[PDB]
Amino acid sequence: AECSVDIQGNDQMQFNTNAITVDKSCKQFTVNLSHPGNLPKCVMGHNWVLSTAADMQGVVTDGEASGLDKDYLKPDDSRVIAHTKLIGSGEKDSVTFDVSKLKEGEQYMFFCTFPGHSALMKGTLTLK
Amino acid sequence: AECSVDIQGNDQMQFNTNAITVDKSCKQFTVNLSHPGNLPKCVMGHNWVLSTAADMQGVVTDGEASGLDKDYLKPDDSRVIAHTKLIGSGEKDSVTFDVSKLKEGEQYMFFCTFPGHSALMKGTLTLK
Ligand SMILES: *C1=CC(=O)N(COCN2C(=O)C=C(*)C2=O)C1=O
Ligand SMILES: [Cu+2]
Ligand SMILES: [Cu+2]
Ligand code: NI
Numbered sequence: 437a438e439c440s441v442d443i444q445g446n447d448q449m450q451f452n453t454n455a456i457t458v459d460k461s462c463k464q465f466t467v468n469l470s471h472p473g474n475l476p477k478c479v480m481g482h483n484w485v486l487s488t489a490a491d492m493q494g495v496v497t498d499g500e501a502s503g504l505d506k507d508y509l510k511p512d513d514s515r516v517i518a519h520t521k522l523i524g525s526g527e528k529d530s531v532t533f534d535v536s537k538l539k540e541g542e543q544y545m546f547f548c549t550f551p552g553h554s555a556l557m558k559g560t561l562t563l564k
Numbered sequence: 565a566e567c568s569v570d571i572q573g574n575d576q577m578q579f580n581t582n583a584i585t586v587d588k589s590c591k592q593f594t595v596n597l598s599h600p601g602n603l604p605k606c607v608m609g610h611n612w613v614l615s616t617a618a619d620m621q622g623v624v625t626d627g628e629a630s631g632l633d634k635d636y637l638k639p640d641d642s643r644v645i646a647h648t649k650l651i652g653s654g655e656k657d658s659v660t661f662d663v664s665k666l667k668e669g670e671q672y673m674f675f676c677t678f679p680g681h682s683a684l685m686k687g688t689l690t691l692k
């Protein structure tokens with residue numbers, strides 16, 4: 437099975453996917469984020485952050501309050517299982533993490549922590 | 565009948581209303597916009613813009629492309645029936661327009677033209 441996925445965040449504030457499935461046979465999983473828009477990071481910056489469904493709100497609130505210089509993520513936030521950098525137009529970034537950090541039966545959410553974006557930019561991630 | 569309405573745009577990128585009814589007995593209509601959030605205009609700026617449902621997309625595209633210095637509205641856009649200024653946290657602005665600019669049967673939309681916000685920040689306005 438494949439253990440990577442390519443995701444896009446555009447100017448309309450949206451991911452080209454709302455659900456991800458991580459095959460249990462994967463040892464590591466990679467996410468390739470790319471920004472096909474024309475707006476700069478400071479106004480339409482997108483990052484891909486993964487946490488349990490329960491931790492999402494907390495991560496989003498503290499992240500938005502941390503500012504652009506911190507890529508909108510409270511430093512040393514242990515709730516973030518994995519995440520890419522905040523990218524602007526024409527930029528791209530990848531993250532690879534150990535699938536052992538995921539458990540079956542648990543509910544995970546991926547989302548962008550740029551002020552207000554998680555309202556639309558979010559989706560589910562499951563270990564099947 | 566009342567001829568004004570108070571609207572709020574917060575940090576969660578949302579209006580506290582999605583439908584406005586302008587009573588035909590009104591000669592003028594006023595909209596009081598206020599920003600109860602803490603985020604600045606440059607990151608979570610909100611404006612209240614009115615156009616026909618059909619002109620909305622056009623207005624939004626040309627507006628987002630106009631930048632913060634223009635309050636995200638293409639200069640001299642004749643599609644904009646009325647609008648307030650773009651406001652940041654703790655700011656407010658009112659707009660009053662002639663109800664004679666509205667006709668019955670026509671579908672109107674109000675929305676924010678800050679990059680990507682119209683996806684969630686929009687609503688209907690009707691002359692009944
Ligand atoms: C992209 C990065 C950046 O700093 N910037 C300018 O932002 C200016 N302002 C402003 O006027 C109020 C808050 C703020 O960041 C970009 O366009
Ligand atoms: Cu985003
Ligand atoms: Cu807005
Ligand atoms: Ni495989």
Ligand code: NI
Binds near residue numbers: 566590
């Ligand atoms: Ni009246």
